[PDB]
Design an enzyme around this catalytic site. Structure first.
Site: not given
Ligand SMILES: [K+]
Ligand SMILES: [K+]
Ligand SMILES: [K+]
Ligand SMILES: [K+]
Ligand SMILES: [K+]
Ligand SMILES: [K+]
Lengths: 263, 264
Positions: B52, B54, B112, B199
């Site tokens: 999932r 954000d 990512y 992040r």
RNA sequence: CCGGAUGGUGGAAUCGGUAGACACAAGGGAAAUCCCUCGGCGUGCUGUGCGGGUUCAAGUCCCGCUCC
């Protein structure tokens, strides 16, 4: 004192009805002027190197204006940007002489067309790339295009709403390549007739999909007939990547992209 | 009635969604995706994603699976669902899988990519798909100051509060930072990540790149096991779930992870 | 016989995916540029000759009717 300033504007026309200022709809030019005006604190009017139709984006657009107000560099760059919408943005400022003029000083414009060639539609940048179902042949396309090179009568790829004069243009170079699932069409000319690029691309695609022979693009060109070529290609995929100006003006020329596209 | 376990490769642009996690109150990628799948299968459908994202984060390698009693030909799931999906969300490929498959649990490692538009003036095109960082980044320096996170470490310093994992430990396969013209990309692959892990790594990596901290800082942070020491969480609009790892036996299609023109 | 019969006109719609792209008109408002409208209703529905059907999905397939 009057100051002639040149700005390198960049934007995403997906949410604008084009550049031209419409007194009833959203236009890149309008949003851009509002800002510039707030900085110069005076009504400002800009002149772009080439107006793009509703939908078409820009990364190499160039504009100029004259303001009586003196603002330091940051004011025009960091400043205007702070007043511009997120989709529109200034890439660089540069004070130019009086003999400069975004449009008339331009020696040749350049475009890039982004074709996402896959059976299923794209999601990311769904408004920034054209989706073409049928499998394109970059190789074949490039070949079937070199016939438009040079000076020809682009009547077949012209438009009925073309407010310009003679339908004759001089193509500097037209190349089609493939980037993974993408197919890019880079074309440079002194100028273009209404919907010239989106039209060349349209018919170029039919060829690529093997729906027509390589010789078709050539047959069309000489056909001097528009109702013969393919229908105008989508907008969302066209980018005004770069404009040519005399080296004497010394305007900054950053990467034309769009995005990760090599310069 | 026969049950069919199907695997979809979803792609999307979370700029306009409050994330994936279905929430009976707001726009979630998962919700829009289920509505469609359901219309095709003509039965309530519930999907399971490989990871999932954000609110804000995009995806191009996301993978989901579901079970429907209804038998639809391939096109129905691909061309079909898409025809029911919003423009920002889209299906990349369908593939019927065995019962032992499971998007999340079968995943061997996620991956990512972070897109950083490094320029003094903000970008316009894809203004919601790339992170704009004012200060001049040093791709070179950044890459170096990152290899210390490689392997298995205790990412507590790059963790969070609202974290649910019972352990902040992870194994980084590879973390590389490169520059594409004005852009700076951070590719990171691990077995898994702790809340806001990427992040966060990116945030502190940027400070280093801007020469506001020494290369040794990323390392000092890692061992510091403290979060209030590292940089603040990096923006979302710039994170892309490019690809997930699954056992080769399932034979799932692996198209280009991008995003966009980014080389595979 | 078989292939067509969709907007004012052409002319589209992935070997069923959710109409009318695209082009050229027309009309109105702010010689030409430009916005919106241009199937039927109206007070979003039904509409790809015409009813009936199958399918999660029909212009796109099965059946009876009109004409090339
Ligand atoms: K659709
Ligand atoms: K239809
Ligand atoms: K339709
Ligand atoms: K029906
Ligand atoms: K019909
Ligand atoms: K029929």
């Amino acid at each position: 004192p009057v100051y002639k300033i040149a700005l390198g504007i960049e934007y995403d026309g997906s949410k604008y009805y084009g550049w031209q200022r419409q007194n009833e709809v959203r236009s890149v030019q309008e949003k851009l002027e509002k800002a510039l005006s707030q900085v110069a604190n005076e009504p400002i009017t800009v002149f772009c190197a080439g107006r793009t139709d509703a939908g078409v984006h820009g990364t190499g657009q160039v504009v100029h204006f004259e303001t009586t107000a003196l603002r330091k560099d940051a004011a025009w760059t960091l400043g205007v940007n702070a007043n511009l919408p997120g989709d529109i943005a200034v890439r660089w400022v540069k004070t130019v002489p009086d003999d400069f003029h975004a449009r008339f000083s331009a020696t040749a414009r350049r475009y890039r067309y982004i074709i996402y060639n896959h059976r299923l539609r794209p999601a990311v940048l769904s408004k920034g790339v054209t989706h073409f179902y049928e499998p394109l042949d970059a190789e074949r396309m490039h070949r079937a295009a070199q016939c438009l090179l040079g000076e020809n009568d682009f009547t077949s790829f012209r438009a009925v709403q073309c407010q310009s004069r003679t339908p004759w243009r001089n193509v500097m170079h037209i190349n089609v390549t493939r980037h993974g699932p993408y197919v890019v069409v880079d074309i440079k000319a002194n100028a273009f007739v209404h919907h010239m690029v989106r039209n060349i691309v349209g018919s170029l695609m039919e060829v690529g999909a093997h729906n027509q022979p390589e010789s078709w693009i050539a047959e069309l060109l000489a056909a001097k007939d528009r109702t013969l070529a393919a229908a105008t290609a989508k907008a969302e995929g066209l980018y005004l990547v770069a404009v040519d100006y005399p080296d004497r003006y010394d305007l900054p020329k950053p990467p034309m992209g769009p995005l990760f596209l090599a310069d």
